[PDB]
Design an enzyme around this catalytic site. Sequence first.
Site, PDB file in Angstrom:
ATOM      1  N   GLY A 187       0.785  -1.360   0.031  1.00 25.76           N
ATOM      2  CA  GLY A 187       0.117   0.100  -0.144  1.00 25.76           C
ATOM      3  C   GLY A 187       0.684   1.264   0.057  1.00 25.76           C
ATOM      4  CD  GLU A 188      -1.192   4.885  -3.085  1.00 26.17           C
ATOM      5  OE1 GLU A 188      -1.376   5.872  -2.844  1.00 26.17           O
ATOM      6  OE2 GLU A 188      -1.453   4.276  -4.098  1.00 26.17           O
ATOM      7  CE  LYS A 232       2.800   0.290   6.258  1.00 24.70           C
ATOM      8  NZ  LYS A 232       3.402  -0.746   6.909  1.00 24.70           N
ATOM      9  CG  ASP A 282      15.901  -3.377   9.431  1.00 22.36           C
ATOM     10  OD1 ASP A 282      17.099  -3.325   9.355  1.00 22.36           O
ATOM     11  OD2 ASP A 282      15.329  -3.164   8.383  1.00 22.36           O
TER      12      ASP A 282
HETATM   13  C1  LIG Z   1       6.010  -3.163   9.474  1.00 24.34           C
HETATM   14  C2  LIG Z   1       5.911  -3.143  10.915  1.00 24.34           C
HETATM   15  C3  LIG Z   1       5.240  -4.384  11.629  1.00 24.34           C
HETATM   16  C4  LIG Z   1       5.223  -4.394  12.946  1.00 24.34           C
HETATM   17  C5  LIG Z   1       5.760  -3.450  13.676  1.00 24.34           C
HETATM   18  C6  LIG Z   1       6.413  -2.286  13.165  1.00 24.34           C
HETATM   19  N1  LIG Z   1       6.649  -1.120  13.905  1.00 24.34           N
HETATM   20  N2  LIG Z   1       7.488  -1.493  14.853  1.00 24.34           N
HETATM   21  C7  LIG Z   1       7.907  -0.359  15.390  1.00 24.34           C
HETATM   22  C8  LIG Z   1       8.757  -0.062  16.555  1.00 24.34           C
HETATM   23  C9  LIG Z   1       9.052  -1.308  17.091  1.00 24.34           C
HETATM   24  C10 LIG Z   1      10.031   0.928  16.371  1.00 24.34           C
HETATM   25  C11 LIG Z   1       7.959   0.647  17.565  1.00 24.34           C
HETATM   26  C12 LIG Z   1       7.349   0.742  14.619  1.00 24.34           C
HETATM   27  C13 LIG Z   1       6.540   0.215  13.629  1.00 24.34           C
HETATM   28  N3  LIG Z   1       6.072   0.762  12.686  1.00 24.34           N
HETATM   29  C14 LIG Z   1       6.146   1.930  11.934  1.00 24.34           C
HETATM   30  O1  LIG Z   1       7.170   2.273  12.341  1.00 24.34           O
HETATM   31  N4  LIG Z   1       5.343   2.132  11.004  1.00 24.34           N
HETATM   32  C15 LIG Z   1       5.577   3.371  10.354  1.00 24.34           C
HETATM   33  C16 LIG Z   1       6.087   4.526  10.745  1.00 24.34           C
HETATM   34  C17 LIG Z   1       5.945   5.695   9.994  1.00 24.34           C
HETATM   35  C18 LIG Z   1       5.634   5.642   8.586  1.00 24.34           C
HETATM   36  N5  LIG Z   1       5.560   6.775   7.791  1.00 24.34           N
HETATM   37  C19 LIG Z   1       5.827   8.051   8.259  1.00 24.34           C
HETATM   38  N6  LIG Z   1       5.480   8.386   9.533  1.00 24.34           N
HETATM   39  C20 LIG Z   1       5.539   9.608  10.002  1.00 24.34           C
HETATM   40  N7  LIG Z   1       6.543  10.465   9.204  1.00 24.34           N
HETATM   41  C21 LIG Z   1       6.742  10.298   7.984  1.00 24.34           C
HETATM   42  C22 LIG Z   1       7.389  11.277   7.235  1.00 24.34           C
HETATM   43  C23 LIG Z   1       7.817  10.946   5.935  1.00 24.34           C
HETATM   44  C24 LIG Z   1       7.710   9.746   5.516  1.00 24.34           C
HETATM   45  N8  LIG Z   1       8.272   9.546   4.321  1.00 24.34           N
HETATM   46  C25 LIG Z   1       7.246   8.786   6.284  1.00 24.34           C
HETATM   47  C26 LIG Z   1       6.649   8.949   7.338  1.00 24.34           C
HETATM   48  C27 LIG Z   1       5.213   4.310   8.074  1.00 24.34           C
HETATM   49  C28 LIG Z   1       5.120   3.286   9.094  1.00 24.34           C
HETATM   50  C29 LIG Z   1       6.545  -2.268  11.659  1.00 24.34           C
END
Ligand SMILES: Cc1cccc(-n2nc(C(C)(C)C)cc2NC(=O)Nc2ccc(Nc3ncnc4ccc(N)cc34)cc2)c1
Length: 261
Positions: free
Chosen positions: A23-24, A39, A130
């Site tokens: 997805g996006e 997301k 990661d």
């Molecule tokens: C795939 C998965 C599965 C299970 C858990 C995770 N986790 N795990 C974590 C921890 C363990 C570090 C707490 C966090 C996540 N998920 C995550 O970080 N998801 C996430 C966060 C931010 C974004 N995107 C943006 N957000 C906020 N500003 C932006 C500004 C610019 C930009 N390009 C993107 C963004 C997308 C997905 C992730």
Amino acid sequence: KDAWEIPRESLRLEVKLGQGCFGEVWMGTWNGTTRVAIKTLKPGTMSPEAFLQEAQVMKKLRHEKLVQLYAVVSEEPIYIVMEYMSKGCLLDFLKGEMGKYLRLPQLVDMAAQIASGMAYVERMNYVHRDLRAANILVGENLVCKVADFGLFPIKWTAPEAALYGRFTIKSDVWSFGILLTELTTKGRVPYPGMVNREVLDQVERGYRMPCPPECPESLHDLMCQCWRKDPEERPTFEYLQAFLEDYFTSTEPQYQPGENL
Ligand SMILES: Cc1cccc(-n2nc(C(C)(C)C)cc2NC(=O)Nc2ccc(Nc3ncnc4ccc(N)cc34)cc2)c1
């Protein structure tokens, strides 16, 4: 189904930020007055009960240096919503226009903050897997937060993990040492010139990255502690946090700026 739930109408989606296969990701607006990152799940590309284990985990793990979940639309199309980080990924920030000016005092501060996020993850007995710059968000005022974008990263992964699958808070620590080179070379690829099969071979035999140009030696030593063959001999994030916070007084009191650091 839970209080994190919101209606799909409280959200004005605005600017695209790129696609993964599932997805996006969109910048936008929640309750017309809030910058959010949204997301997406493309329907049928995966099940809810897996796409939403992310939001599930982001509900357990809440901390000032971790990315912040806001709300869920957990009925298709499915949306996850979190606070918007105005400077994007830490990797783009270090290699981009902003990296010209970042000196060792801001870089270590960034380091101190990610460490602090990681201190919480250690405390919570959770494991990242990661840690690296591509997974840190930068916000207003050089505020960093640990995130996971669901991006093999052997260059960042400790041997015991790439080899045998023994991921631990201690492999996360190795990864931290790799992050310290990213910060100190403006996000250059670690191990320049080596290709994955040679990193495994080379690090297996004790090879370790040299002091980056201009990086102080004591930071290199910290990287080196992070990269010990023996998982249990690598330091805690709590130690890392404190040592970094305290850097310019306890460890490098005579620090002077130079051209790049
Ligand atoms: C795939 C998965 C599965 C299970 C858990 C995770 N986790 N795990 C974590 C921890 C363990 C570090 C707490 C966090 C996540 N998920 C995550 O970080 N998801 C996430 C966060 C931010 C974004 N995107 C943006 N957000 C906020 N500003 C932006 C500004 C610019 C930009 N390009 C993107 C963004 C997308 C997905 C992730």
